[PDB]
Amino acid sequence: VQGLTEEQRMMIRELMDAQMKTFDTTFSHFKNFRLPGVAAKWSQVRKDLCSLKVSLQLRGEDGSVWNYKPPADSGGKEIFSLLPHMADMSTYMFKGIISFAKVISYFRDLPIEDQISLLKGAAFELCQLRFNTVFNAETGTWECGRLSYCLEDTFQQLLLEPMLKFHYMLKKLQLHEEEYVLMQAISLFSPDRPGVLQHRVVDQLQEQFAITLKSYIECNRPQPAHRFLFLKIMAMLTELRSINAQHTQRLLRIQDIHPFATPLMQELFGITGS
Numbered sequence: 001v002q003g004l005t006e007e008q009r010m011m012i013r014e015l016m017d018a019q020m021k022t023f024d025t026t027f028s029h030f031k032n033f034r035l036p037g038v039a040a041k042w043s044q045v046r047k048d049l050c051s052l053k054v055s056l057q058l059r060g061e062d063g064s065v066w067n068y069k070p071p072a073d074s075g076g077k078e079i080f081s082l083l084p085h086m087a088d089m090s091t092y093m094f095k096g097i098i099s100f101a102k103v104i105s106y107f108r109d110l111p112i113e114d115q116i117s118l119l120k121g122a123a124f125e126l127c128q129l130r131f132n133t134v135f136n137a138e139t140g141t142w143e144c145g146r147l148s149y150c151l152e153d154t155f156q157q158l159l160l161e162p163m164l165k166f167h168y169m170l171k172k173l174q175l176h177e178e179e180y181v182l183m184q185a186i187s188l189f190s191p192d193r194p195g196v197l198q199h200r201v202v203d204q205l206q207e208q209f210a211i212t213l214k215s216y217i218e219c220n221r222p223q224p225a226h227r228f229l230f231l232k233i234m235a236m237l238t239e240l241r242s243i244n245a246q247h248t249q250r251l252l253r254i255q256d257i258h259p260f261a262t263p264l265m266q267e268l269f270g271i272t273g274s
């Protein structure tokens with residue numbers, strides 16, 4: 001509303017427009033995805049994979065329901081059964097993220113080589129930000145339209161896994177749509193991603209997205225619960241970058257022993273094909 005400059009309001013409008021056009025919140029176009037079948041190293045890969053045990057539910061348009069419960073680790077390959085499905089979901093999410101960036105004027109004006117570097121740097125993080133908006137913290141469930149992913153009761157022991165503590169702590173802030181898309185912009189325009197050339201312009205763009213966020217919070221959120229909301233959000237973005245670097249290493253480890261990354265995932269994670 002008011003309290004923001006015209007450039008700031010236009011900035012938020014452009015991000016909201018881009019989010020509206022490229023985030024399929026009902027996941028209606030996520031289709032033809034794979035499903036789990038009807039050294040050590042392997043030790044590290046086994047703990048890498050048992051962190052996020054999730055059950056899966058699919059509600060058919062006709063009213064039927066399929067439910068999938070994963071196996072326990074039995075020292076064998078059953079730990080890989082969800083990877084093809086998660087790869088297809090990640091790939092679907094990444095395409096929406098790429099379309100989000102491409103619709104935004106500030107991003108489209110950078111050199112293409114820096115566009116690519118920025119997308120490689122932040123695709124994971126924008127994916128997690130979008131998933132948080134469909135996260136139900138009461139049921140521990142990501143509600144993706146006809147699909148649901150539910151954490152398997154194994155509990156603050158779950159809040160020990162950094163991605164999961166991230167989703168609960170971010171949901172707790174009860175952000176608006178505008179604050180989520182500003183979080184996405186700040187993360188997308190990070191001057192320090194590997195291989196970025198235009199450090200100073202990306203940093204100025206980022207600073208302007210951060211300032212718009214701080215001003216949006218100050219003019220629209222006077223309640224004592226939202227004191228320091230801006231700084232809490234920025235601490236969450238720092239944590240999410242840390243989560244990004246751990247899960248990049250985790251993906252490359254799993255990929256080393258059990259290949260699964262899609263071609264789009266390989267491009268974003270720097271896998272060359274040889």
Ligand SMILES: CC(C)(C)c1nc(-c2cccc(NS(=O)(=O)c3c(F)cccc3F)c2F)c(-c2ccnc(N)n2)s1
Nearest residue numbers: 052054086090124127128131142149247248250251265
């Ligand atoms: C749908 C739901 C339940 C919320 C999930 N999303 C992701 C998730 C979130 C963000 C990005 C990617 N895909 S990814 O390509 O970034 C990636 C993997 F697919 C696998 C391992 C690491 C990794 F970074 C994801 F799979 C999940 C995820 C993330 C990392 N590892 C595992 N095993 N699952 S689980």
